């Protein structure tokens, strides 16, 4: 509940990020400029993070209040308060490995000393 | 000697006569604009002043521009003679209808084609111009505006001098600061390298550039033979040759470019002789010429630097280095040689509104002419017309943005007429084109012995902006260039001269200025042989009574307008006087005003020029009057009517009215006041009332600046004010639809909307309480109606609705904007500020019943009790004398004269020996009743109607306690003292918050009283809590009452029930911090184990 | 955008030079995202104003 004996910062890894996130962003499109709704798998799609509103399935199939933890097959979204939208993340998949800017540029450069 | 026709009669403790009336207090603000636009009156005034060339502002700016031309020389354009037209609509409608007081201007442009030889001339429209009303204000979009003057250092030459700490030798530095161009610095150093720094470059020897012009070396030798160090420098320089010199100069300026003679020869004239690239204001050229005494006999026309100026400057520098006192140049009369000072008012000019507007329109004209010339160069040459050339968007946009966002366009604070006048007369020193707060030195914020007569030393804001915001003196008037002046009468051979002249700073220094207060015989003969005097700078010393040349006009020649109406100003302290002056600009207009019993003679004049009181133009006879309008019949048979606005919200939230003070069938003379605006009584300022004060500590309720008030004030509306709020809602179109105001609103009980009418607005005259609905609307449908904010109430006096159907201009994207005015009457209550005119603030500690206050021996209860320990420490003894004089004037006096005038009554005006009850008296600043006068007067007050005199000779009296009922053992002081009312009311401050709307982005409660939000909790409070060792309280304050949502809900539910408060949870801040730090690949675990 | 372009380009096929250039562009994009202005010219879209990267929080 509120017990924190310690706090340790660990260096993550690809599989860790795979575990953390709930989606795979693929398009840069922001909220729609006409209907003011997210685009399919866009940067705000409810299929990634969650419903814009609370207890509201995207297609309206399970919009009733008495729905919690039930994922809608018709629209592929989960039914929970809008707060859950603030507590879920997404991960981009890379087609080419990269480096962490904080290391090859930091002074001292951890990569330089280690390698 | 009441200049105005029918001002109230109030004899004054006059001893000296001022030979000139106070000049129009707003003439300074209006003269600038009058010059800028150009009108016959300004031309006549300029001709009277003797200036040879009458030149307007618009004409000057748009004549120095023309004739524009293309580089091929086959085309040219000219356009001059700007003229204006009539008004669009009167000021009242412009302010009420949301329009902008303006007028159109037309310029006659002539379109000439070189190779052909044709002329195409016709009028052209050039947008609108925000004309200036007769009260020196700009009405923009219905909101009042007032631009404040500014202080800038006049472009010229300043000879600085810095002493070396090691060498201990004088280094004379001369720096030229033109309007725009290059900066030249000639400094003699220990190494003797007399060089130049053009555009912050390396110090290159002056001889290099001197020869670069082709100046003959023999002429260098002969003209500098008297100079020794510079002769050594000449012998020390290596490079010689006009071509070599100019090429070296060009390389130093522009290295890496083809070095050729033509390049440097052209660059010289381009950087020092092409007027467009290098320009100086006529003020700068005139000041430089006066400084060197060169080119004095001719009116300056060319505004470019010239070589003779540079050679004379270097000669002056070397002569100063030699230590000479005065220097002479052929063609120039003798002048002294000395260093200049930055903080002297012979250098710091004043740019009125004219200069600012001229510069802005100049920028606009440059932007327009660039595109015009490009268009004419590229556009077809056959059928081109000036109508197609001129583009009007840039200039109008420039003026509009200057009026909108420029820091020199501030809303005219309008608490009372005095505040408006002071704001119109202000002298700013910061803002665009000026120094910043951190870079401005601390020395500039201090006085300078040349401030006497130009900028008041007392009036100044208390905040950090101290010394950067002054105010014109009473008699100061700006010269046509921008150097403040001040009147003087010149003594020819020891006899005073009634005729007067105006002298600027420089001429003031060069003469001897006498003292106004020094006694002078009626025949003009100096009774004293030795008369004190002010000298060059900070020097004062007696001198024989013949050599004295100039004498001031009146003792009040250095005070500001606000400080000029503080009685007994010669007795208080500097800080206290400044505090009182600043306080006077914060009064609140009451409902029933009363003129002060003791006040300077500069009250009615400061009100007539304040503009907030109407006045007849021609001497006529009134036919009929009414509470809303008046009709005066002129002697020529022309009937005229004046409309008086009643209960119109002031620019700062207070009310404004006008109540005519004239009767039906009176031949009112021209210039006689007809109506009294806010804070006025019979055409003279009245910011407060007259209360009977007593000075004694009373049961600690008046402890440490507190104050006690009798309930008689509360129950008699003696200090009752009116405040008018203002709200507005709008229905703007959206992509999802257009919102419409409608009486109906979803899911609302009939009682809630019982006030709204058919059209969807609250009916006029319906009481409204906090949290009530004020106007209903539907959002495509949701409910977003406007409701009264937290902590407002009162009647609804009027509703204004603007509709697009009726062809009413509205901001783009809106259809119906409606504003509602709510007016509330506030009675003075606990927690309100009060303060006299001597800067003694306070708060109403407690309002006792009328039956409890101490009462005089005859049953007259006092109205306010002041503490005594704060008088001698603050050292503001003036207020005691004011109280004594107030009581003396109120009770009326009659000095014995049967046996003859008492010695102490020798200088009293012969008409001031016999007064009536509730008499009026006025003590001009620095010339008022002396202590002997008060001593004599207090011994002759008329007895009360009961036959007995209350106060003693000293001024104290015997009281009777209201609680115990027995007399105090010792006498106490009493009298009538003027009391104002400040704007820091209590209803605005008080506020509470238990549970209410929560912010959506930060999950924290809103802030501000209007939004019904909680208070801030600074880190210092966290430190204090930590110091006490309190942990759980801090945990609550940080977790359960600010962030944790479920925590808030659970604690509220538990409190509603009888359950114990559950322990707080995890704050939203920490969880956000996690979910944000996990995004940088830093796996932040918890390790609950 | 850059990642989706890399994927499409590798699907279409191309010699080493273009693919390596695109990979360098992706690397620069990632470096800018994790921190703007850390090295080289910072990205500026409006008024030549440096943007607030993730590390600026
Ligand atoms: Zn669904």
Curated annotation (Swiss-Prot), chain B:
Q: Mutating residue 110 to R: effect?
A: Weakens interaction with TRCF and CarD
Q: What's the reported outcome of changing residue 119 to A?
A: Weakens interaction with TRCF and CarD
Q: Name one GO cellular component term.
A: cytosol
Tell me a GO biological process for this protein: DNA-templated transcription
List the keywords (alphabetical).
Antibiotic resistance, DNA-directed RNA polymerase, Nucleotidyltransferase, Transcription, Transferase
UniProt-reported outcome of changing residue 410 to L: In strain: vr4; rifampicin-resistant
| TM stretches of this protein | none
List the Gene Ontology MF annotations in alphabetical order: DNA binding; DNA-directed RNA polymerase activity; ribonucleoside binding
List the catalysed reactions. RNA(n) + a ribonucleoside 5'-triphosphate = RNA(n+1) + diphosphate
Alphabetical list of HAMAP family matching this protein: RNApol_bact_RpoB (MF_01321)
Q: How does it assemble?
A: The RNAP catalytic core consists of 2 alpha, 1 beta, 1 beta' and 1 omega subunit. When a sigma factor is associated with the core the holoenzyme is formed, which can initiate transcription. Interacts with CarD, TRCF (Mfd) and RbpA.
The protein in question is named DNA-directed RNA polymerase subunit beta
Which gene is this protein's source? rpoB
Curated annotation (Swiss-Prot), chain C:
Expression triggers: 6-fold repressed by starvation.
- Provide the family line: Belongs to the RNA polymerase beta' chain family.
Quaternary structure note? The RNAP catalytic core consists of 2 alpha, 1 beta, 1 beta' and 1 omega subunit. When a sigma factor is associated with the core the holoenzyme is formed, which can initiate transcription.
Q: What does this protein do?
A: DNA-dependent RNA polymerase catalyzes the transcription of DNA into RNA using the four ribonucleoside triphosphates as substrates.
The protein, known as: DNA-directed RNA polymerase subunit beta'
- Organism field: Mycobacterium tuberculosis (strain ATCC 25618 / H37Rv)
Q: Gene encoding this chain? A: rpoC
């Amino acid at each position: 509940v509120n017990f924190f004996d310690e706090l340790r910062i660990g260096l993550a890894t690809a599989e860790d990020i795979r575990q953390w996130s709930y989606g795979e962003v693929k398009k840069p499109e922001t909220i729609n400029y006409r209907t003011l709704k997210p685009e399919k798998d866009g940067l705000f799609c409810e299929k990634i993070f969650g419903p814009t509103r609370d207890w509201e399935c995207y297609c309206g199939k399970y919009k009733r209040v008495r729905f919690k933890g039930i994922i809608c097959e018709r629209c592929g979204v989960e039914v929970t308060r809008a707060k859950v939208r603030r507590e879920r993340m997404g991960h981009i998949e890379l087609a080419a490995p990269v480096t962490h800017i904080w290391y090859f540029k930091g002074v001292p450069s951890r990569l330089g000393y280690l390698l | 000697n009441n200049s105005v026709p029918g001002a109230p009669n109030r004899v004054s403790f006059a001893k000296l006569r001022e030979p000139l009336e106070v000049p129009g207090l707003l003439d300074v603000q209006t003269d600038s604009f009058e010059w800028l636009i150009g009108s016959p009156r300004w031309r006549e005034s300029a001709a009277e002043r003797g200036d040879v060339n009458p030149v307007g502002g618009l004409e000057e700016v748009l004549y120095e521009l023309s004739p524009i031309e293309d580089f091929s020389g086959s085309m040219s354009l000219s356009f001059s003679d700007p003229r204006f037209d009539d008004v669009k609509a009167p000021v009242d409608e412009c302010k009420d209808k949301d329009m902008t007081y303006a007028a159109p201007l037309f310029v006659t442009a002539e379109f000439i084609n070189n190779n052909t030889g044709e002329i195409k001339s016709q009028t052209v429209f050039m947008g609108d111009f925000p004309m200036m009303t007769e009260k020196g204000t700009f009405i923009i979009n219905g909101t009042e505006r007032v631009v404040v003057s500014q202080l800038v250092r006049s472009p010229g030459v300043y000879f600085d001098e810095t002493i070396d700490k090691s060498t201990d030798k004088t280094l004379h530095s001369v720096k030229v600061i033109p309007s725009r161009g290059a900066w030249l610095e000639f400094d003699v150093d220990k190494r003797d390298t007399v060089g130049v720094r053009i555009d912050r470059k390396r110090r290159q020897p002056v001889t290099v550039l001197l020869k670069a012009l082709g100046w003959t070396s023999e002429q260098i030798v002969e003209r500098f033979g008297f100079s020794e160090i510079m002769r050594s420098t000449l012998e020390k320089d290596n490079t010689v040759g006009t071509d070599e010199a100019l090429l070296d100069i060009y390389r130093k300026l522009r290295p890496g470019e083809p070095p050729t003679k033509e390049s440097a020869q052209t660059l010289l004239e381009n950087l020092f002789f092409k007027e467009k690239r290098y320009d100086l204001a006529r003020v700068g050229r005139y000041k430089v010429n006066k400084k060197l005494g060169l080119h004095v006999g001719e009116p300056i026309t060319s505004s470019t630097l010239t070589e003779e100026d540079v050679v004379a400057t270097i000669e002056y520098l070397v002569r100063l280095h030699e230590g000479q006192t005065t220097m002479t140049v052929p063609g120039g009369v003798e002048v002294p040689v000395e260093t200049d000072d930055i903080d002297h008012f012979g250098n710091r000019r004043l740019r009125t509104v004219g200069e600012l507007i001229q510069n802005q329109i100049r920028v606009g004209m440059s932007r327009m002419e660039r595109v015009v010339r490009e268009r004419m160069t590229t556009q077809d040459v056959e059928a081109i017309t000036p109508q197609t050339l001129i583009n009007i968007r840039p200039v109008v946009a420039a003026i509009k943005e200057f009026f909108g966002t420029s820091q020199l366009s501030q809303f005219m604070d309008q608490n009372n007429p005095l505040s408006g006048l002071t704001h119109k007369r202000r002298l700013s020193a910061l803002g665009p084109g000026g120094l910043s707060r951190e870079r401005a030195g601390l020395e500039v914020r201090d006085v300078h012995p040349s401030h006497y007569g130009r900028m008041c030393p007392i009036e100044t804001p208390e905040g950090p902006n101290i010394g950067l915001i002054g105010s014109l003196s009473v008699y100061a008037r700006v010269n046509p260039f921008g150097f403040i002046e001040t009147p003087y009468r010149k003594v020819v051979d020891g006899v005073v001269s009634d005729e007067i002249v105006y002298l600027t700073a420089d001429e003031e220094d060069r003469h001897v200025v006498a003292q106004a207060n020094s006694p002078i015989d009626a025949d003009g003969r100096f009774v004293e042989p030795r008369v004190l005097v002010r000298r060059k700078a900070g020097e004062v010393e007696y001198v024989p009574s013949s050599e004295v040349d100039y004498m001031d006009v009146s003792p009040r020649q250095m005070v500001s307008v606000a400080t000029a109406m503080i009685p007994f100003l010669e007795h208080d302290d500097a800080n206290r006087a400044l505090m009182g002056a600043n306080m006077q600009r914060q009064a609140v207009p009451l409902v029933r005003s009363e003129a002060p019993l003791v006040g300077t003679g500069m009250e009615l004049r400061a009100a007539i020029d304040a503009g907030d009181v109407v006045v007849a133009e021609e001497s006529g006879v009134i036919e009929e009057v009414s509470a809303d309008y008046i009709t005066v019949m002129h002697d020529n048979g022309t009937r005229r009517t004046y409309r008086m606005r009643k209960f119109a919200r002031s620019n700062h939230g207070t009310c404004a009215n006008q109540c005519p003070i004239v009767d039906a069938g009176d031949r009112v003379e021209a210039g006689q006041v007809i109506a009294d605006g806010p804070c006025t009584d019979d055409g003279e300022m009245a910011l407060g009332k007259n209360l009977l004060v007593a000075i004694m500590p009373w049961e600690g309720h008046n402890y440490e600046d507190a104050i006690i008030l009798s309930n008689r004030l509360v129950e008699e509306d003696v200090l009752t004010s009116i405040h008018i709020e203002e709200h507005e809602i709008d229905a703007r179109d959206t992509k999802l639809g257009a919102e419409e105001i409608t009486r109906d609103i979803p899911n609302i009980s009939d009682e809630v909307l019982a006030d709204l009418d058919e059209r969807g607005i609250v009916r006029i005259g319906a009481e409204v309480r906090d949290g009530d609905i004020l106007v209903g609307k539907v959002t495509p449908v949701r409910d977003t109606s406007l409701k009264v904010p937290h902590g407002e109430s009162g009647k609804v006096i009027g509703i204004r609705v603007f509709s697009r159907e009726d062809e009413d201009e509205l901001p783009a994207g809106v259809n119906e904007l409606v504003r509602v005015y709510v007016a509330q009457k506030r009675k003075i209550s606990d927690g309100d500020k009060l303060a006299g005119r001597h800067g003694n603030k306070g708060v109403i500690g407690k309002i006792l019943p009328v039956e409890d206050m101490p009462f005089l021996a005859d049953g007259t209860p006092v109205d306010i009790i002041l503490n005594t320990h704060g008088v001698p420490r603050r050292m503001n003894i003036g207020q005691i004398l004011e109280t004594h004089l107030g009581w003396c004037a109120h009770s009326g006096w009659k000095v014995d004269a049967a046996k003859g005038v008492p010695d102490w009554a020798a200088r009293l005006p012969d008409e001031l020996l016999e007064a009536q009850p509730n008499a009026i008296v006025s003590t001009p600043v620095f010339d008022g009743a002396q202590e002997a006068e008060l001593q004599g007067l207090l011994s002759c007050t008329l007895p009360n109607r009961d036959g007995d005199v209350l106060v003693d000779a000293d001024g104290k009296a015997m009281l009777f306690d209201g609680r115990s009922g027995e007399p105090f053992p010792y006498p106490v002081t009493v009298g009538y003292m003027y009391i104002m009312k400040l704007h820091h009311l209590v209803d605005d401050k008080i506020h509470a918050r238990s549970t209410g709307p929560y912010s959506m982005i930060t999950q924290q409660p809103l802030g501000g009283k209007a939004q019904f939000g909680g208070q801030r909790f600074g880190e210092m409070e966290c430190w204090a809590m930590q110091a006490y060792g309190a942990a759980y309280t801090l945990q609550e304050l940080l977790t359960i009452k600010s962030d944790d949502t479920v925590g808030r809900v659970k604690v509220y539910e538990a409190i509603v029930k009888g359950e114990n408060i559950p322990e707080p949870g995890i704050p939203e801040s920490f969880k956000v911090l996690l979910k944000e730090l996990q995004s940088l690949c830093l796996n932040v675990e918890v390790l609950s184990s | 955008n850059r990642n989706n372009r890399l994927k499409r380009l590798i699907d279409l096929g191309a010699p080493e030079i273009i693919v390596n250039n695109e990979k360098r562009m992706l690397q620069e994009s990632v470096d800018a995202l994790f921190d703007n202005g850390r090295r080289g010219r910072p990205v500026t879209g409006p008024g030549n104003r440096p943007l607030k990267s993730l590390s600026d929080l």
